[PDB]
Amino acid sequence: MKRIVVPHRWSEMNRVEHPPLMMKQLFQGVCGGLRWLETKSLAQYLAVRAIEEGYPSTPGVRSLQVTKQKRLVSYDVLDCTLGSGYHAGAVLENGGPYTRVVALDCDHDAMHAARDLVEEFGGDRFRFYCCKMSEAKAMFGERSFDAIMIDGGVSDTQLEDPERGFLLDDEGGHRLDMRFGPQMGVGALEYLNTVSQHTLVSSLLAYGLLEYGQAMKMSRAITRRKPFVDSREVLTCIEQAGDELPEGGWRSQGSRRKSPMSWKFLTSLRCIINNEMYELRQGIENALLMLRDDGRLVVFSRLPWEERLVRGTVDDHPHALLSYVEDISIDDVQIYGFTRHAKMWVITRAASSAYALKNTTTLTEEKFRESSVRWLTGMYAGQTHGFPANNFTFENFERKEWVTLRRN
Amino acid sequence: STNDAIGYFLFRGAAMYAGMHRVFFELSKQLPHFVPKTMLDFGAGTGTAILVAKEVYDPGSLAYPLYRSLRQTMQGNDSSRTHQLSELRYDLKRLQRNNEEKKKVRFMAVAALLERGEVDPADLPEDLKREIAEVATAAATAKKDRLVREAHARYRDVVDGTEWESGDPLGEVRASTEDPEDVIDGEQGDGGDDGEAAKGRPKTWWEKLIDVENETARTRAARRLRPLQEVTAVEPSPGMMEIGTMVLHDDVPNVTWKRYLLPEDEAIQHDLVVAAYSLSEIATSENRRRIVQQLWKMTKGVLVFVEFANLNNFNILMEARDWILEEKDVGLWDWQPTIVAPCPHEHRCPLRHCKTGVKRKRMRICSTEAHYRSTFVEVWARHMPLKVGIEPISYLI
Amino acid sequence: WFMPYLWSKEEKAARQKSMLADLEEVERRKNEHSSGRSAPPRTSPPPQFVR
């Protein structure tokens, strides 16, 4: 009678979790909306129906044959990145019953946070997969979730782990594999030893920070001095070109433009590997496909290029409307140690006429004269009679393809 | 850049799609038993070569169905022949069977299973009705793949308003369960020895007919023949990578996007390494002789070079043919390079050293050509409406 | 002859300086670091045995 256990490693013994960013401000954002009130009105409509048929009550003032039993009022939420599960746990706890959370993550180490949530409540309220946030539309389809919450960046579990990278003040040579999941390729030690000087500059300029006068100085130091045994020889070369790293590490409460070139390089090199420009742009535009009509979308932004991407998407997408943007409360910066520039962008979807709201504020006279030219010259034309264009239509089915679904 | 990657994919999309379907048609014919369980794509700018390798070796797990009437969907692979057998059996029951007795079992069992749920009593008085239950379980699993093809997205069953089943939410006991179907030669035991003595039993045409007409063992033959589990794509430019991710993530799930090929990376052994239109794009500063020698050492199975038919590209491909054929007598005989397609002699190519090719440029390229239905982009940029486009390609398997 | 005829004195001086700098960098990197790998090995090799 010998029980077998695998010996724990130091990253497993001294594992730290991620602090809650905002709990009450998220629950009003990711739950509350037009999809929430008609859900809460449907629960009150079913309660007064239950006392009508003759069920036992309390004195108080008011597809196919295997799956015939479908669920009641339940409010389906998708978590693109659960991380430590505090934002995924606030929806199922404070929402009470009739709520669900489907959680995704890039790292398999979030199964520990997914395991601890099922022990409280599971099987019918929690569901977990391991995938990127851009592959959510490919595995859930359009109009799938009543709400979608999106986080970004690195959790505090991956920061303090010496095997996951992200250690700046450890004074020891560890491999600088700073990536969020196994679905990406090379890490930063293998990137900076193989990237050219031109490819590194063009990747740094995509994230706004570390502009062309500063990006060519940091890339000159990398490409000329790259025997890189470990992260320690990289951090000496980075801090020699620019200033030394701040004492706050990755989380610096200073200004964005007043931050040193060493912090601007390391925060952008983290974004180069995991491709946060592609992951957040496709994570937002697929979420507006997967949302229901008048749903809610919550995206957290902690970087100034992320504030341009959320602002740039909602003005051009013909369903997205920014409900409100909330900054981080000042008390959560002290006890938890978050970034002061962290905002919460609560985006809602429109049923129709989303551009009629945006033309109230943003409609200039030069936009009106440009719109007259594009109708006269016909620049709003697409393609219909080409080879791939004849097989494409809108979301509503035609009369020609309803006869196809009868036989198929 | 990403603006160049849009114009590269919209203009050369159907051209590279047809050039890769030409090579995989010969690879499925010449090597019928090959299933590339892990795939590396060198220089995968746009994921056309990964997408056709999904279409050739796994036509059933795609989001959208293939046009079944085409010659390009008739491959010689074991996974393709399994999917073609299901589509053939659909055509047999619909066209070559005039009896509507197939309908009589269907609409009765639909009416039977509907009425036993809430009106009729239990199935306990009717004995030996396991033929109804095991078909209805198999018909239910046929409905699960039916809604995937209608919605063009897997994991649609959790989207619906059905209740989630309590127990295993994370998928831990489904990915770690011991399969009772895989039995190696020693784990079998204690049977009648006449089954292991009498050899050559299923040589009759009647016993071959019962071998294919049942579908319970075909799914057991498909779970062992996993066609594409892990796919690795290599691309240095960020403009091509973010558009190659948009092509592949709808139909090819869980693709690892590496940014650079390292001399460290040749310790990972893949079944298929595809360098599609990538040998010509290697810059002159990088040693191309080192890269094509590294790509050969990452092959469990097939290494596929596909290039456009040009004078500079054919000299690159014939040098890469000579560099890999130089690795013949280095060691173990079972790992030496063999040319499967096109040149069967393994000497120097006679068209490369012909007399006529000195003063004639036409007699220089040992290539082939693929035909395709051109899109609206190619007929706009060439000013002539070509309903059939021509893509000349030089390939090497 | 056209390429040295086009170049000035400081351009040829910068060309020779960059050529000698890249040459000595390549020579010191092939004398110090071996076996490629685009990375130093970070660990002493394990002890080999006579087989």
Binding site: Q197, H198, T199 | - | M3, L6, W7, S8, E10, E11, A14
Partner: peptide, 27 residues
Amino acid sequence: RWAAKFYGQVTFGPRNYPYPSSRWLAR
């Protein structure tokens, strides 16, 4: 003007290629 758009696209090595330095170019 379409050819000058790719000058910011080439690598820094063969960018100024008829001249060794890029300081004395036309700016």
